[PDB]
Symmetry: C3
């Protein structure tokens, strides 16, 4: 095998990125996301309780030692009183766990602040949803920019279209002229139908799905600049090597890796 | 894309019902059921450990307070009595650490206790198993009422049949007459074959599965009166508005939505 | 209810084996492996933390009891001796929280150490990945023994081939004659292409799959003798009812059953 080292290193890195229990959930399935978010919450609060209780167990042992020293010294005073003072100091030190270390709340807004995080909406066609779907990503603090990123993993089709509304004058009236989600979606379906690897039932299902609305499946807001998301999308569309890596394998891994690439970019490989 | 109120809000509510990792496992996959059951076990045991942690924290704080008062007032009868009262209260609080609370678990079993909750058996065809499956639902406290609910998901096919048996006279003998599961399954398969939207290879697998007994994939016991289960089984095959949400989407989403709709009737959406 | 009760018992045993959410992950999707690993880690952590909670709460209870007894007496040796006993028990239990004995070596492996276990690499064909996939099992302490086991569950074929390299003499020179993994893969694909039960588009995908290297999905490992893995693989190939039980059902459950039966020859079936 002539390509079992240079691209195998990147395959190992990609596998490491995909393989986790609280990161990169499946986009088209609320169940996987609900499992992963709860695993995150459980591990987080279990770690919090274990560290808090370890320090409080230290102080409970100190208090027990102080009481035992008092009992063993009564039957002289400073041998127990300084232990009690140290116990008071360490109890005060350990009891402050309300907002001691929550740095990931305010320091994580270095890239984007809260309520400005980009909105990714996940849609899918209603008759071949496992294979064909798309994301509609909306920007904030411009309120007029968005984009559409569509996938058909049955045939390995990737499509990207911006959706920005510009002021236009039709006659002596005005309008917000820019490609709309519905016509971009129908354009994607039309581009998918006239393709040489059509199953002869895949195309019929695409045509049937053309006349009806797509199926909503949720939204995923992440801490990353919208322009960075646009850069990652354009990177996914054109890079042949990224398409070779993230667009091969089991369909579940396909969608997981595609979400990972959209979230991170080219940093997932190497 | 463009739907003002109805379909959008119904799909939203359905997503919130399906956005939890506790309820509505995928019936086809016992691995997901095991994952969800273990997650439930971890949740319950950690809330028990949390209440024990709180009570242990209070008793440790009381002991440390007594020690600190002794240390800072050594160089107390009203304090000795209050310390005993606090210790007795904390011992009473920690006495119920037996976790013997079954009333909240049985609070929904006011009229539907165990061994009376209807059982549901999940079955699947051997060949196109991901798309075609069915439920055999058996009731208790009657031992005569049962039904069959079969979904072929790829073709959008739903079948409901009533397997209630009753006494019958056959010549000078008697029997328990009524529709039975085997012929119900065979008739459902026959109806599935004759749909016009086949695949000329799906039909081959389907008829090949017609000569093999179905595959048992587990049983489920839920806190629902069998009258409600029958009502939901009729509603899922009747209400096309319900089906347009439950029966449309990715397959893994679809089976969970079907189970949820059968469980809560029309409460999954709206 | 079907044909036999022994068959139903075997199926129930298999479903109980796969019922657990902590064992036998899906060999193709690393996300399931990550979720299962985090579940197992959380369960063991909660066991250890529950032990620690019991220890600390009982120690605090004993300390409070001794303090209350001393306070009541002040208003003999029983209070002094029990406090020393509690201190000794607490010290013994806290100092036993290392678990660094050589028993930990057998507490996880218990059969064979590191650099002595076989590793099973998982690959899948690039295009119809969720159906066709193979295991490359390479052992240790021989460095010249290995085997190949491939599955195509769309047309239901399983193939096995050893890749052992024996010393061979050709001319007046020597070579290490065995089987090339690429030859094994390509022969398997040639076997799959010429099956009469063809989809006429699956074959158009297999022929394309021939001329591209497969994707490396990971390398799992279980502490089992390599000869045992060979015997279990040849059991998967050359057994009838094992194939009828493992290779029929939903794809996810099928693959989980395949991995479980590779781990466990017939003990998985019961």
């Amino acid at each position: 095998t002539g390509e079992s080292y240079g691209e195998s290193v990147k395959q190992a890195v990609l596998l490491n990125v995909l393989g986790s229990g609280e990161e990169i959930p499946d986009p088209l399935s609320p169940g996987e996301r609900g499992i992963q978010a709860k695993l995150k919450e459980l591990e987080d609060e279990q770690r919090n309780e274990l560290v808090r209780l370890k320090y409080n167990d230290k102080i409970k042992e100190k208090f027990g030692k102080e009481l035992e020293e008092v009992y063993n010294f009564m039957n002289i005073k400073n041998e127990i009183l300084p232990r009690f003072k140290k116990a008071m100091d360490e109890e005060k030190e350990i009891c402050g766990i309300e907002d001691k270390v929550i740095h990931p709340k305010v320091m994580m807004k270095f890239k984007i602040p809260r309520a400005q995080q980009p909105q990714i909406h996940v849609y899918s066609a209603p008759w071949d949803s496992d294979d064909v779907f798309f994301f509609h990503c909306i920007s904030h603090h411009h309120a007029n920019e968005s984009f559409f990123l569509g996938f058909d993993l049955s045939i390995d089709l990737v499509h990207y279209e911006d959706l920005t509304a510009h002021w236009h004058a039709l006659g002596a009236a005005q309008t917000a002229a820019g490609r709309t989600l519905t016509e971009a979606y129908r354009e994607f379906l039309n581009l998918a139908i006239s393709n040489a690897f059509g199953t002869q039932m895949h195309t019929r299902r695409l045509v049937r799905s053309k006349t009806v609305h797509p199926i909503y499946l949720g939204s995923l807001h992440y801490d990353i600049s919208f322009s960075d998301l646009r850069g990652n999308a354009q990177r996914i569309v054109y890079d042949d090597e990224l398409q070779m890596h993230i667009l091969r394998g089991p369909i579940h891994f396909q969608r997981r890796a595609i979400l990972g690439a959209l979230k991170f970019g080219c940093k997932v490989l190497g």
